[PDB]
DNA sequence: TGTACAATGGG
């Protein structure tokens, strides 16, 4: 019952689970956001992932869970200001893609937050294997993030199905690495 | 590349 860990569990416990309908709606928004981000990259000559990360950094203020173990830190503030500057200065026709991209990353963050409880339930099955509980959570969280990136809502499978696959993969890979 | 029943206290 690590104080910081107990506090994380308390915090993710307040995030309600998504209904099927909401799940589909968020996943749809993430897809649309990635397509818009592609367009912004073509227009600006900037890396898609760099655009995504900056757009994310600008929607985190409205987020429910701020510090999530295992998640990539925001880029340095100067990179943010610079890239956010270029995106904001784009012509009318392109600024709608920016709106769609912002909606997508806001949706991604929500979808991730609403599944942190699943990561924890799986992690509990892997304790005493060389990684601390907190470490299991960090690795599981990175599997969750990968799940979100590759999830295809059109297959009509529940998100928990695909996330479980990835969270186990990530945790198993981390355990095998620790072991050498 | 692709990785997919559901699973979020546990069984
Ligand atoms: K019961
Ligand atoms: K009970
Ligand atoms: K029961």
């Amino acid at each position: 019952t690590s104080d910081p860990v107990r506090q994380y569990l308390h915090e993710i416990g307040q995030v309600p689970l998504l209904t099927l309908e909401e799940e589909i709606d968020l996943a749809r928004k993430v897809e649309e956001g990635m397509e818009a981000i592609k367009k912004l990259s073509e227009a600006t000559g900037l890396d898609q992932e760099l655009i995504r990360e900056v757009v994310r950094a600008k929607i985190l203020g409205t987020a429910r869970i701020q510090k999530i173990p295992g998640l990539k830190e925001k880029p340095d503030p100067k990179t943010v200001e610079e890239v956010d500057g270029k995106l904001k200065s784009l012509p009318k026709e392109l600024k709608r893609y920016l709106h769609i991209a912002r909606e997508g990353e806001a949706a991604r963050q929500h979808l991730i937050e609403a599944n942190l409880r699943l990561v924890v339930s799986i992690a509990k099955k892997y304790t005493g294997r060389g990684l601390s509980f907190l470490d299991l959570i960090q690795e599981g969280n990175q599997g969750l993030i990968r799940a979100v990136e590759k999830f295809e809502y059109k297959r009509r499978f529940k998100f928990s199905t695909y996330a479980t696959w990835w969270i186990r993969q990530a945790i198993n890979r981390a355990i095998a690495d620790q072991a050498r």
Side-chain angles (χ1 to χ4, degrees):
Chain A
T1 176
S2 164
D3 180 80
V5 173
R6 196 178 49 106
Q7 175 66 28
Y8 173 73
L9 300 192
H10 171 72
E11 289 184 359
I12 70 181
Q14 325 252 67
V15 181
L17 297 185
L18 307 164
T19 62
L20 178 54
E21 290 63 41
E22 303 173 315
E23 193 176 276
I24 287 162
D25 187 71
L26 296 175
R28 181 164 47 236
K29 277 176 171 62
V30 172
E31 293 197 352
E32 289 160 349
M34 292 298 281
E35 175 52 55
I37 280 172
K38 181 175 152 300
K39 289 290 174 181
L40 298 168
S41 176
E42 297 174 341
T44 62
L46 299 167
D47 177 38
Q48 296 181 39
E49 166 72 355
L50 177 55
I51 289 169
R52 183 174 138 192
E53 283 191 58
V54 171
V55 162
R56 174 178 191 285
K58 288 300 182 179
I59 59 68
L60 266 176
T62 318
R64 295 181 290 188
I65 313 272
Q66 291 284 359
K67 301 196 185 189
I68 299 172
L71 251 96
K72 187 144 39 79
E73 211 76 23
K74 298 197 283 198
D76 73 78
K78 200 277 154 290
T79 301
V80 160
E81 174 194 33
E82 174 149 25
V83 168
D84 188 39
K86 305 183 179 184
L87 296 172
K88 270 162 121 176
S89 78
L90 303 173
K92 188 78 182 278
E93 316 76 69
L94 279 39
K95 222 171 288 156
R96 79 178 186 94
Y97 290 128
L98 182 58
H99 170 81
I100 296 178
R102 293 169 174 151
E103 294 274 4
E105 290 311 304
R108 184 195 308 279
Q109 170 72 14
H110 213 252
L111 181 59
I112 290 168
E113 294 170 339
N115 287 275
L116 296 169
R117 291 159 54 192
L118 173 65
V119 164
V120 166
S121 73
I122 292 156
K124 287 160 56 180
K125 307 262 167 45
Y126 290 90
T127 57
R129 295 243 250 146
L131 297 183
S132 68
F133 190 46
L134 175 59
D135 274 13
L136 288 169
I137 291 175
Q138 299 190 345
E139 303 286 336
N141 282 358
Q142 291 177 47
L144 170 63
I145 284 139
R146 176 64 176 165
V148 176
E149 298 179 331
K150 306 302 294 197
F151 179 67
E152 296 171 4
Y153 77 92
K154 286 189 163 164
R155 303 205 194 189
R156 299 180 298 113
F157 298 126
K158 292 299 308 307
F159 181 71
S160 74
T161 299
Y162 191 55
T164 294
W165 189 87
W166 271 107
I167 293 155
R168 288 176 173 168
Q169 285 295 323
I171 290 177
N172 273 322
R173 171 179 124 183
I175 290 174
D177 293 341
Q178 188 68 27
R180 270 42 263 190

